[PDB]
Design a protein around this ligand. Structure first.
Ligand code: QMJ
Ligand code: QMJ
Ligand code: QMJ
Ligand code: QMJ
Ligand code: QMJ
Ligand code: NAG
Ligand code: NAG
Ligand code: NAG
Ligand code: NAG
Ligand code: NAG
Lengths: 336, 336, 336, 336, 336
């Protein structure tokens, strides 16, 4: 009763060459690909890469595997995978892709009577996702995932998504858990690229990422906001208290300087100004400007005290208003 | 006397196919799984992963391995493991699982006359354990461990725990040693998940983790507590000592600011406020508020000194009481 | 003359099964283990692990390998190691063990006429060594090394050390070079553990480690000691110099606070107080207490200056004596 | 119709030795190499290495593979690659080179009737790129890429670029994306090196790198520039304000000191002065010199106040001019 | 014409056993080793290890490989390397050695008619180089490289350097490029070690390393030197300026303290004082002593101002002279 299956497997492997694609010189092999994202690994901004774990699957038709028997399906494992022909699928953007071999190589091979073949594999792809940090942290990233044949051009092997976009790519509810990103959706597409070796079909899947704010607020913005308010306290102190007001100006300026250096330690070493950088620079101007007002006041406090006192009183009102007004423009400009 | 065993092994391998599960098309294969945790590796909060070393074991019935001989058991090693059929067990949540091959691949294969098979393997699983750090550090984590068949659905292979929960999962006394966690217990369960490929049984084991407090007390809370007390010292200084009291307010505020940044360096970059963050913010208000009182006093110390002196004396009593009262509410709220 | 050896090897492999232990069902296999430590790798306190490189060797008797020839010994290499049976030795505590394959797999196989077999292997074991940091840095660590059979219980395979403890375990003179530890000696032992799978003999080797002090003295203790002395300088300053004495108290307190945070960065995140922590806390009290005395003096310097002056003069003598006395108790308590 | 291809493959492998190069003892094997850079990985300055992902390809003529059939080309995969002879190409400067095996080993093997063979491979090379950081960050780096035969000297195997330089080496538009470098172009060349083993042809490809400035401006230069301006504010303060001006000099000097240490943390530990180091040193002199002027003024402010006041007024103009003039020389000298 | 080579290879492998060394029981195998250092990797002081890439080569005589043919040499690749016998050479001090397999395993096998065999291999050795940091950074390190047979004692296999020391070991001109070391030369030697397994010949190569100074000057020495000068500025300030002089003493002392902690972060955690540590301690005394003089002056400035003024004037001259004199002794003592 079990020996029947053994004979079927031997017959299929008899006269079957794994080095030749099905329907060679007779038609164009058609492969249907479906992907399931078990978990979306962390997105490393420093290296412009992200880690994703998926159960990649491919379906194709092979007439050489036709068989007749009481059972309409033949579930199997990785043992027979190497005995037959499989597409040389690879990721054009993947920097380091490895599979899982424990406890057993996570592979499946299901064959039907008509010859249809299902082959699912588990992979962890450390693909590269370039990011334009011009509106950072109010930036949206579209990380793609490109894969295709390595040796078979479009004229021989063609990859096509199965059913609609939703069924083609599926993400687990708990898989999309990123500490500093939100998975807003997924999209798929196909295209042909012209290469010296030939034309190859490219299967591209794009993931929409919306960075979640709140970590930088407690890390960079809030210390800067409170630092500016700290400097404004000097405006409420007496002019003759030269030493007391000097500490506020010097300490606040240095505090802002170290925050900028510390803030960018985690940020990638990008050679352009980000939105956060402008906010820090503006905050630096307020604290720096406050010290200049105190220095200017102390220079003329002996000649014309009347004007010096007026400026100090005016500064107590003008500076808070400008800082508050600036925030509304800054936050509204990006949060819209 | 020894040659008898050699003949038995040859007979079993004669006509035995390792690509077909036992009892194919006749019944449903039943597998009993028992796990022993040699050591519970570190729990990395930054990557939301934990490392665990276990001696995973599986038991199943195979009639093709029946034999008769003087010895009722046939202890063996990994050499014969590849010669027979084994389940394609895998961890649905494991991110990187590897075995130990030194000195020899840590595997066993014991076979009885009735055909029962025992197969134990040693593995190190770097599984992912998402955590909700809303009550951090007063948070309880339930890290699961999900595993099951990769190619055989529930209709063909079924996993069931052996005996009770205590016997099914065992943790070594010295294995459960975490520098910042306590292993409060273990639990097991089974469920069926509906997938496009089919229905698969899932064996889930949950470990109860109770974070141990005391490291953060010496790291974050105590410096904050002493910093607040340091600011309150300014209330005991003379009002005319403008410079002396200025140092306390400025230095304390900056000290709190750097602690918040330093404290969250180890903490995961979560985009929400934790319990520790609120405690820091409240402590920041006290030190920041103290400076405001000094600034307010210095502004009116010339017009109405009577009220200014009253506030300074009152501040010496009100502020310590509020800080002490706040701690009791904060600690009692979470420690209960 | 050389062809004679070739025939001998072929004869031994004829009818020899590597899947069966020698003397199966006739006696209990006896294995003698000798270890040589080429180099004792670094001891990582953060991960509670240590790296050790050893030339592990095993000796056992096998009658199936008996041969007669002009040469009494047959030196060989790893090529024939896989062709015969070897014990499934493994480390019960090893977290990641790997061998060296360059230039050639470092293995030997020597066989005598009587059938005795010598098999030496080179390994690098990243074992786990839990430590109780209650007296840190005045702590002594006893890192064990447990290994034994994985599939053969005590009733089949037994491990016994050869000769005495000194000969069984040998450490190279230059191998025991640790930047923050001293290798005070080695010890060995054997025991039987009862397991669900059966009873297995355990070969445990313990290494005595005595942490060497001097790195923390220049890193933590000395800055703390000098910081306390710095605060005491304020006692020699005039009371009216409110600003001058304020800097000492504030700066010293903050300096101690940052040292505690910086000091524990390298230390493991243990949720209990160490001996160093108590020393820091005591030093923190002295600097903190000095500020309180200055604040207390400034509060009553106008009402009863006589008592205020007396306290300041007394503080110059009392505080240094207490700090000096405390050190003698602290150092003597642990250094004894 | 498909069986025809199978017979052709068997015929070619019949009597074909993969250990012998084509045309042995009859001519000199000629190999044409073409390279495509999929992505130029990060350039690590600390380790003087860079990561590059390329689709390395080699073409050569082999008469032993001649065949006749309806199809003029025989696309294949890695399965037949090991069955034939391939050059032992290697990178003379590569420190760690690994290929990608997922989903399938990324290799191709195309054979024509005339016997021409195309063999493309995907590799990730962590080559070493020594850099002379004398004009850092205004430095241009020329990272080479050397490869050639390991066992076949120039008299047997010769490597030659195909077509022109542009076609020989191609870089993807999105591949050349470096956070702190610009890919200004590529160049190729060939040379013969005399070695004890023999003469080997070397294929060298040089990549022109132009470091992009702007990250260090926000990291090092700007804090230094603002720090110098901060010190100059003391020149506008009254001489009798000894305490107020003391803070500026001390705080600014320490701020510059920490920036130099922090700035070089990312920079490689080079034992020579860079252009940035000189800029920091000059900025340090200005802040340090300003303190000396204040100290000098305070020393003679009692004897000859007339000269002291003149210096203070003059310093307000001289110091800003020198700092501004120095920047123009510094920036113009390197930015030209 | 090409088939002749194929027959020769088959004949040599006929009756050839790779498990037996040449001339077994007839003589002692002699192996000549020559080494070429392609590049000397970084020397990691923290782990007391260094990385080196070499083209290790071995030459020996084997009469079993004698052949007659038109070609006097048979260049080959790694394919035939495993088919013959090769020495089990290994590095007695190497902690992790791996080869390069891309594009092809970098190995060669050349055989002459007389039977001489040449076998060159490329390796990357992460050997351990213990260092005595007593004169750090004015320290000279002699990193050795020990290798020899693992299974064949001196009585069977002997390693001898070929020709002189210069030819035996060769270092590329661009290979010896270390950011903090100079390669002053190389030396070789041979010795016999007595081991329980037997006597083995050891081939030791020593590399002379002279640490290059200049990185620590800009990192540690210069900030310390300028810090001491900064403290001496207080000697030029008026005694009554208690607050002004207090900042210099406190700020300088703390600045020195943090430099010592920061300086040793990169330095290995050695439990003894280095030359740099003594320099820091001496610099700490000067800044600390200066504060004591100010405190002492302020204590007696009211009783006997005459002596207080004299000390302040004297301090302006004595302290700079002692610091300058100390440097000459310190630098001359080690730089000689
Ligand atoms: C989409 C094609 O199928 C796959 O991609 C694929 N390949 C393997 N497994 C799947 C399926 C897909 C949907 C969810 N899913 C699993 O997560 C899973 C769970 C199992 O239960 C322990 C066993 C196997 C799988
Ligand atoms: C639960 C099924 O058995 C396993 O999971 C299993 N597999 C291997 N070993 C075990 C057992 C389980 C209980 C403790 N235990 C060992 O730790 C151990 C110790 C030995 O002694 C050196 C030898 C073998 C094992
Ligand atoms: C104790 C059983 O023997 C071993 O554990 C063992 N195994 C290999 N080698 C040894 C010996 C042991 C003592 C020192 N020792 C080596 O270090 C060594 C040195 C050699 O010379 C290059 C060659 C081989 C070895
Ligand atoms: C220059 C010799 O050919 C190669 O170096 C080579 N080798 C493989 N593939 C290429 C080509 C070269 C140009 C771009 N290019 C690919 O990126 C590519 C894209 C494909 O489509 C999914 C499939 C294969 C390749
Ligand atoms: C000393 C024994 O020979 C070796 O150690 C050895 N082994 C391989 N290759 C060498 C030689 C040694 C001298 C320089 N040298 C190479 O760098 C090299 C360069 C080549 O050209 C691309 C091809 C092969 C080698
Ligand atoms: C790619 O080529 C195939 C050839 O059949 C064609 O059907 C398809 O439309 C092409 N795709 C694009 C985007 O041009
Ligand atoms: C899963 O399916 C099996 C089928 O036999 C059933 O016995 C079991 O009760 C199911 N489990 C759950 C949780 O529904
Ligand atoms: C372990 O078991 C063996 C069985 O022969 C016995 O000889 C030995 O004494 C036992 N060891 C201990 C520690 O009980
Ligand atoms: C290298 O050697 C070949 C031998 O044919 C010669 O043609 C070529 O010109 C040489 N290259 C150089 C740069 O000398
Ligand atoms: C090592 O042993 C060999 C044996 O032939 C001898 O020739 C050689 O001199 C010995 N070397 C030393 C350093 O004793």
């Amino acid at each position: 009763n079990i020996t029947i299956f053994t004979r079927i497997l031997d017959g299929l492997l008899d006269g079957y060459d794994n080095r030749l694609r099905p329907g060679l010189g007779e038609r164009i092999t058609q492969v249907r690909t479906d992907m399931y994202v078990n978990s979306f690994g962390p997105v490393s901004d420093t290296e412009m890469e992200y880690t994703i774990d998926i159960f990649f699957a491919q379906t194709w038709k092979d007439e050489r595997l036709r068989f007749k028997g009481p059972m309409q399906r033949l579930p199997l494992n990785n043992l027979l995978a190497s005995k037959i022909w499989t597409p040389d699928t690879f990721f054009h953007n993947g920097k380091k892709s490895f599979a899982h071999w424990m406890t057993t190589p996570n592979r499946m091979l299901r064959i039907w009577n008509d010859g249809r073949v299902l082959y699912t594999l588990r992979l962890t792809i450390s693909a590269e996702c370039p990011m334009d940090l011009e509106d950072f942290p109010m930036d949206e990233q579209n990380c793609p995932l490109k894969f295709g044949s390595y040796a078979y051009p479009n004229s021989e092997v063609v990859y096509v998504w199965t059913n609609g976009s939703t069924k083609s790519v599926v993400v687990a509810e708990d898989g999309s858990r990123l500490n500093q990103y939100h998975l807003m959706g997924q999209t798929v597409g196909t295209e042909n690229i012209s290469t010296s070796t030939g034309e190859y079909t490219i299967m591209t899947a794009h993931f929409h990422l919306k960075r979640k704010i709140g970590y930088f607020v407690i890390q960079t913005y809030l210390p800067c906001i409170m630092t500016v308010i700290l400097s404004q306290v000097s405006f409420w102190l007496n002019r003759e208290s030269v030493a007391a007001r000097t500490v506020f100006g010097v300490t606040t300026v240095l505090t802002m300087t170290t925050l900028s250096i510390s803030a960018r330690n985690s940020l990638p070493k990008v050679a352009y100004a980000t939105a956060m950088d402008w906010f820090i620079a503006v905050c630096y101007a307020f604290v720096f400007s406050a010290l200049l007002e105190f220095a200017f006041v102390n220079y003329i406090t002996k000649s014309q005290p009347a004007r010096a006192a007026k400026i100090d009183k005016m500064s107590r009102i003008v500076f808070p208003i400008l800082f508050g007004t600036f925030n509304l423009v800054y936050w509204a400009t990006y949060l819209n």
